[PDB]
Write a protein that binds this ligand. Structure first.
Ligand SMILES: *[C@@H]1O[C@H](CO)[C@@H](O[C@@H]2O[C@H](CO)[C@@H](O)[C@H](O)[C@H]2NC(C)=O)[C@H](O)[C@H]1NC(C)=O
Ligand SMILES: *[C@@H]1O[C@H](CO)[C@@H](O)[C@H](O)[C@H]1NC(C)=O
Lengths: 104, 104
């Protein structure tokens, strides 16, 4: 139940890109989920702010929430698509895949 | 209800660090709160992944969650403190003050 990367597959049909695209038909976009709480490492899975916010939340849970599980590393995906002039284009889409999660 | 920066003043005395922390006696540590949903405001600086995730969540709310409202721009603060051996240390702690929030 800790802050971690979960598997998620996105087909290009879900984006309505299916008719445009040749390869791939989808990709593993993945997602960050989990409770953000101690232990926390400021050189691994948390920021200094996230450590301080966890402390404030423990003292006053009413008004300040816990930090949240978000990406630390994102990868690009390369897509091969057709255009109207029947050109074959290779486009790199940055910040598209989740590699590692952390508390922010 | 939308993702934004909320003001929060962190005083070291309520944290219980007043003895060993010389300067400052507190600081404006702010926090991120709110829903990451469409419309995604340009200030959010949402990644391509966050956009896809808010879209995937809208189709299957059951399994895939909304992306995180987290800090996009942090500031460092200098802390003057007493070491465990009574030495006076002047450390710059990075990622300490939230300047701006966003979705990822
Ligand atoms: C942040 O990273 C640390 C270690 O780098 C993770 O530490 C583990 O915490 C879990 C939960 O208590 C335990 O199973 C292990 O005993 C811990 N290892 C160490 C070396 O302390 C920690 O879970 C991570 N935090 C989050 C929110 O993901
Ligand atoms: C800035 O704003 C938009 C829309 O929310 C986003 O898609 C883009 O990636 C952001 N740019 C940077 C440089 O963070």
């Amino acid at each position: 139940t800790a802050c971690r990367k979960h598997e998620l597959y996105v087909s290009f049909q879900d984006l309505g890109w299916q008719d445009w695209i040749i390869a791939p038909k989808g990709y593993a976009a993945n997602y960050c989920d989990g409770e953000c709480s101690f232990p926390l490492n400021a050189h691994m899975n948390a920021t200094n702010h996230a450590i301080v916010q966890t402390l404030v939340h423990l003292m006053n849970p009413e008004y300040v929430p816990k930090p949240c599980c978000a990406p630390t590393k994102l990868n690009a995906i390369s897509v091969l698509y057709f255009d109207d002039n029947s050109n074959v284009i290779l486009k790199k889409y940055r910040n598209m895949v989740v590699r590692a999660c952390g508390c922010h």
